[PDB]
C-alpha cells in the first residue's frame, strides 16, 4: 500500500532519527521520571517540543509512566545516569527512547494500513549478535504516546513486513554517495566508512567489483569497540577532578558541556582543560588510525575515499584527517548518515 | 462488536466523506458510463483509485453497471453535463456517487454481522422537504459495488435505525468545534458558520445561552438558494464566448477549469479571464453579504466567530472576510467541514 | 555486464528497429524463397547487405530455410502480395522478419552470457487483443540465422522476462521528446502522435497533469483500422487500369513505385497518374481529419503539439496539416519515430 | 491593437523610466508610510504630482496600503532607512517603486486591452544570476494602483512574454548610438560604457568585429559591487561627525543634501565639508582607474571612445577623465541614458 517509512537509531549518544518525509530529530539519550509542567509553561512557552519533551507513554496494560526525556531531562538532575546506561537492546530505557522519536516523526492523521516500514540499526559486530533480540522487541512494541503541553497522541503498533534490521553504516555508503562518486569509483577501489560512534565506532568497508558495484568485506571491517568518544567523557572527567584539586565532580550535563568546549565555568570561574582536551582527541585520533591499520595492510592504498561519519567524527576530522590526507573527506550531514542511509536503503521495500 | 460509522456529503460540487477511521475520500460530483479498461492501465501506473474509479455495481436486479465516476468521469466527453443535474436525492446519480463514498471508506475483511452508521446531509431549507426522499432512498439502497481494477467488493445494504439525517452546517459548529470554541463562546452569543457551496450557500447559526450552550435559530438562518459557484460558471461561460468570439463554447472540464484558475488553455494559447472571474466572485460576494443582513439586523454586532467554509469560501476567504473582518476565520477543512461535523455529532448516539 | 537492448517494429509497410547501440535498419516487409547467389554477386558489388539479404534460418527441427528479404524480395516475381499479408503476429511471415530485424542489430563476437532486452510493438488497438499471441511467438522463436554471401551467423533465442511490449505510439512522445517538449507542455494540455502506417493509421493521446507529467486517455485515441496507406495502394491499383484500359494490372513493385512517384514507367513511357494520387491520398486526409473529430470534441483546442508520424506522414506532413496548422510539427524520424520511442521508454526499467 | 511599451529603471538610487511615448520620469528609490496630506492641500498647490506621490496600492484580496514614496518621501523622517535598502528583486519595495512608475508612464485614454511591454534592467553579474525571481515576480504582479489627491487610477498586472529583460547599459550603446558610432567605431575597437550607479557600478564593454557590428565581451566587462556612489555618502557622513563632533548623525535627508551639495545647514549655520568631498571624489574616481584597467590591460589601447552614465559620474567627469582623457566622454542624459537604451532596444518589438 501506501505504508510509510521512519529510519531510526538506537546511538548512545543521541539518538537520531528521520521519517520518509525528510523531517528529521535528534535528541540524546537520556531519560528521567517526568514531573507536572505547569508553572515553567507560564515563564517560557515551548516552541521547540524536541527541546522540552516532557511524554506519557501507555503500555499494552493501560498503566502510564511519565517521562522528562531527551533535552529536557538533561537539565534535571536526577535523570538517567547515562554514562553507565546499559547495551541491552530489549532495556525500558531503550523502549522509551525507541518510542520518543517515533512520536516525534509520525506525522498527523495518517491512514492505519498505512504502516510504517521502520528502519534500524545495528552494530556490526552486534548485528548477527544480536538480531532477534529487537526483532523481539518491535514485534512487541506496542504502545500509546501522549505529549505532555502539545496534546497529541499516536498509538503504535509493528509487526514483520515492516521491521527491516540492517547494520549501522550499511547505506550510507551503499547509497546517497554510492550514486554520486560511481563516476570516481571505478575497479576494484575500497571506499572506507568510518562512523564515529559515542561508545562504539565502526569502521566499515566495501568494495567495487568488476560490474562497478559494492561487495563487502567482513575480514577488513569491524567495530571499534568501546573505541571513540566515550573515553573523551571519561578521561576529561578525570582531568576536572585533579585540576580542581578538591575531588569536585562534575554533573552529566557539564561534562556534555565540557567536550564541546573544553572551559567549565566552575564556581565563578572557568577551569580551562584546553591541554587534555587536544591530548585526549589526539589520544583518540591516533587510536583509530592504527587500529584501522590492522583490518588495512596495504590495501589501504587501495582507497578512493575515506569517509568518516557520526556526531564523533565531527570533532574528529581535522585531526582525524591523518589516517590519509587529501583523500580522506567527510560526509555532508555526519551524525545522520546513518539516517539518512537507513532511509534509502531502507527503500529496498 | 460495535457498529461502525461513516459520515459522507452529497455536495453538489464534490462528494465529502469520512469514516469512523478519519479516512476521507473526495472526488467530483461527476457520473460517467464505465468502458473496458486495460489498456490506460499499461501506459500508466495507477496509483490513486480516486482518479481512476472504474467500478461495477450490483443493484435489484442483480445486474451489475459499469461506471465511471469521480475525476475519471470528468476527462470523459460523456459524462453528465453537471450543471442540470439534478436535485432527487434518490436518483441513481446519486446513488453511483453514495454507493462510491460508502465503497471506498469500509476497510478490507471487516465482519459481516456488524452494520455501519450511515449519516448524510441535505440542504437547510430543504432538510425538511427532503427528509423522506433520502429515507426511501436508503431503505432501498440494496447494492454489490465491484471496484474494477482494484479488484475489492463491498455488499452495500441497510436497514431501519443505521441512517442518520442532519442538515448542512448542522454539527461543524455545534459539534467539530465544541471542544475549542468552548472559550470562546462566552454569554449570549451567535456563531455562525457559511457554506459557499456549488449551487446553494449556506447559512447556519447558534445561539449561545446563558450556561454556555449552542441552540438554533431558523429566522437568522437559511439557505441561499441557488446562489452560490453555480453564478460563476454560468458567468464565466458567457465570458469566454465573449472573449472568443467564435460561437466556440467550452465543454465540461475547460470552464470547470477556468474558474479554478481563469487562463483556459484554448488553441496554444491562455485565454485570459482573470478580471471576469474576479466580478464573478464579487457578484457572488454581494449576494451572500447582503441576504446576510436580510437575516441579520443589529446581531451581526452579536457575533463572536463567524466561520466560512465550503470549497468555494477557500478562493473567497479574504473576499467573504468583509462581512466582519478580524472576527471571521477560516474552517479547519474548508471540504470537509460538513463531513466531520456529521462524524462528530453522529458519534453523539 | 549488463544486457543488450534492442527495439524494433513490426510495423505493415517496413521493418523498422533500432538497437542499444543507436544503429537502426529499415527494409520493406516482404518475404521470398532464397535462391543460391553467386552469380549476381559477380556482377555488381554488394556493399550494402539490406538491398541483398539471401539468408539462412534454422528452427525447432535445425533445418535451414532460404530466404530473400526486404529490397532483394522486392524485386523478386514469386514474393508475398503484401497486400492479404496477415495480422497474425505469431506467423513465420512475421518471423523472418523479426529473424532479420534482430539478425542485423546485434554485433560480432558479443558474449554469449548476456540476454537482450527486445522491445517489440503492436497496434494499439490490437495490443490487448494481440497481446498474448506475440508472447507465445516470442517463447516460441529459437531460431539460428545464417546470411549467406556475408557470412556471419546469430544465436537468437529469448526466455522469459527478457520481451517487452509496448504499444504504438507509445513511448514515441511520452518518452523520446520528453527531454525536449517539458518545456512546451505546462498545463493540463494534449499532446498527440498521428502515426501513418500501412494499414493502419494511429491515434495516440497524452495528457499532461497540473504537475507536468503525461498521462493517458484511450477515448480519445484510438487506432483507425484499415485507414492508411493500403487505402493509397489499392486505389492507385485501379487508377492504372483506368488508365492502361488493356486489363494490364500492376505487380507487387509497379504498384509500389508507383504511390511513390506518381509515374510508373510502363512500355517505355511514364503513365501520368499524379492526379489520382492526389485524390487517394486527400480521402486518406479526409478520412484521419473528420475521424480525429470523431475522438476529439473541443479538446482539439485542448492541444500544446500535435505529432505526425509514419512514412506515410512523410508524404502527408502538409497535407495532414489541416488538423490543427502552425501547431503540428514532424516527429524527427518519419519512419524511426516507433522504434526510438520503444528504445528509450525501454531503457526505463 | 499594439501592446503598450514601457522602460523602467530599477536602480537603487533613483528609480528612472520613459514609455512608449517618450515621456520620461525620474525620482529617488525611497519609500514611506502614506498619510492624509489634506491639510497642505489647502495650503500649498499640489501640481508637480512627481513632487507629491500619496498613492494607494491595491491587491488580488483587496487590501490597500498608503504610500508616501520619492521626492515626497525625502521629506518625511518616517520613509525607509534607504542605506540598507534590500537587494532583493522580489520585494515589495520594488513593487512600490514598480509601480509608481507603470501610472506615470501609463498616461490617460489608452487601450487597456492592449497589454504592457516593460524593459527593466538587472546587475550585469545579476542578470542571469538573479533572472528568474524578476521573471517570478513580474508575472506574479497583479495589483491596482489608486493616485491620493489626483483621483486617476491603473490596473496593473503583467502575463508573461510582454515583459523584456536587458543588461544596465546594455542597449545604451548596443542601441541608441550605434547609427551614429558606426562612422566612429571603424575595426577591432572597442566601445566603452561605464554606468557610475549609486550601490553598484557596471564596466560593459563591445568588441566590434571587422564589418562594423558590435559583440560581447564578459571577460572584459564587470559590474564593480559596493563600489559607486554609496560610498560617497559612506564617507562623507563619518566626515560630519568628524568635523561637528557632537555625536550627531544626519538623517537621510541631510546625507542625500550634502553629497549634492558639500555645505551642510547644521545648526543655524553652514557647516563645511567641502575639502573631503572631492577627496572621496578623486578617490571613487581611483577606484574606477583600478577596476577598469582590472579588466583592461594592453587592450585598453584599442579602444575607440569610452563613455561613461550614471548620475554619479556626470559630476565625476574631470576626475573620471583620467583614466583615458579626450577618449572618454559623456552620455548626454547620465540618468536617461540606460531607461532610453532600454526602451529604444526595446522598440525592436
Ligand atoms: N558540536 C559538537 N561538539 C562536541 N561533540 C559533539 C558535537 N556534536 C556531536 N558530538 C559528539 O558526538 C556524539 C554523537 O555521536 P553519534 O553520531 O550520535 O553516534 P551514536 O550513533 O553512537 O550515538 C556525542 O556523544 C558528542 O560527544
Ligand atoms: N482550489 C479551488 N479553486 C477553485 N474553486 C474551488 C477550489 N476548491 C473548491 N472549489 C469550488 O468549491 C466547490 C466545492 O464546494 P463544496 O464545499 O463541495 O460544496 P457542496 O457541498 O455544495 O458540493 C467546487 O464546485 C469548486 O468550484
Ligand atoms: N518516400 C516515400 N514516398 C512515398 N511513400 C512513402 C515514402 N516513405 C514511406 N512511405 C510510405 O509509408 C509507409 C511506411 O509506413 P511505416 O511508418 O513503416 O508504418 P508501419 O509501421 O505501418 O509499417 C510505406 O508503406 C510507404 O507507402
Ligand atoms: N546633481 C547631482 N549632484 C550630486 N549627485 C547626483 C546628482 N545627480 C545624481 N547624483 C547621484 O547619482 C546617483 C543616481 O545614480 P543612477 O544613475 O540613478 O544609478 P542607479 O541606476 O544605480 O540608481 C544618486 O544617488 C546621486 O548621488
Ligand atoms: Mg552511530
Ligand atoms: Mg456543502
Ligand atoms: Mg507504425
Ligand atoms: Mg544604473
Request: glycine share 6%.
Amino acid at each position: 500500500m501506501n505504508k510509510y517509512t521512519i529510519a531510526i537509531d538506537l546511538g548512545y549518544g543521541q539518538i537520531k532519527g528521520i521519517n520518509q518525509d525528510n523531517k528529521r530529530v535528534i535528541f540524546p539519550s537520556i531519560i528521567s521520571s517526568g514531573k507536572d509542567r505547569s508553572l515553567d509553561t507560564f515563564f517560557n512557552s515551548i516552541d521547540n517540543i524536541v527541546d522540552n519533551i516532557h511524554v506519557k507513554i501507555l503500555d499494552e496494560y493501560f498503566n502510564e509512566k511519565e517521562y522528562f526525556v531527551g533535552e529536557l531531562a538533561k537539565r534535571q538532575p536526577s535523570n538517567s545516569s547515562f554514562i553507565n546506561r546499559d547495551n541491552k537492546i530489549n532495556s525500558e530505557e531503550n523502549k522509551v527512547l525507541l518510542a520518543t522519536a517515533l512520536g516525534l516523526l509520525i506525522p498527523n492523521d495518517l491512514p492505519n494500513d498505512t504502516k510504517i516500514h521502520i528502519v534500524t540499526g545495528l552494530p556490526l559486530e552486534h548485528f548477527i549478535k544480536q538480531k532477534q533480540a529487537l526483532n523481539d522487541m518491535l514485534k512487541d512494541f506496542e504502545h500509546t504516546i501522549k505529549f505532555v503541553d502539545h496534546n497529541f497522541s499516536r498509538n503504535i503498533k509493528f509487526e514483520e513486513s515492516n521491521i527491516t534490521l540492517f547494520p549501522q553504516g550499511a547505506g550510507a555508503i551503499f547509497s546517497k554517495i554510492n550514486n554520486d562518486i560511481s563516476s570516481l569509483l571505478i575497479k576494484e577501489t575500497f571506499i572506507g566508512l568510518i562512523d564515529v560512534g559515542f561508545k562504539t565506532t565502526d569502521i566499515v568497508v566495501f568494495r567495487i567489483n568488476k560490474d562497478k558495484e559494492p561487495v563487502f568485506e567482513q575480514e577488513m571491517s569491524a567495530t571499534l569497540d568501546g573505541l571513540g568518544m566515550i573515553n573523551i567523557y571519561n578521561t576529561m572527567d578525570k582531568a576536572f577532578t585533579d585540576n580542581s584539586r578538591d575531588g569536585s565532580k562534575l554533573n552529566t550535563e557539564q561534562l556534555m558541556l565540557l567536550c564541546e568546549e573544553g572551559k567549565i565555568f566552575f564556581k565563578g570561574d572557568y577551569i580551562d582543560l584546553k591541554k587534555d582536551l587536544i591530548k585526549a582527541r589526539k589520544t583518540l585520533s591516533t587510536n583509530i588510525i592504527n587500529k584501522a591499520d590492522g583490518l588495512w595492510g596495504s590495501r589501504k592504498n587501495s582507497f578512493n575515499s575515506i569517509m568518516i561519519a557520526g556526531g564523533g567524527g565531527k570533532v574528529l576530522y581535522n585531526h582525524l584527517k591523518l589516517i590519509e590526507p587529501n583523500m580522506c573527506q567527510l560526509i555532508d550531514n555526519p551524525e545522520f548518515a546513518n539516517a539518512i542511509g537507513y532511509l534509502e536503503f531502507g527503500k529496498q521495500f
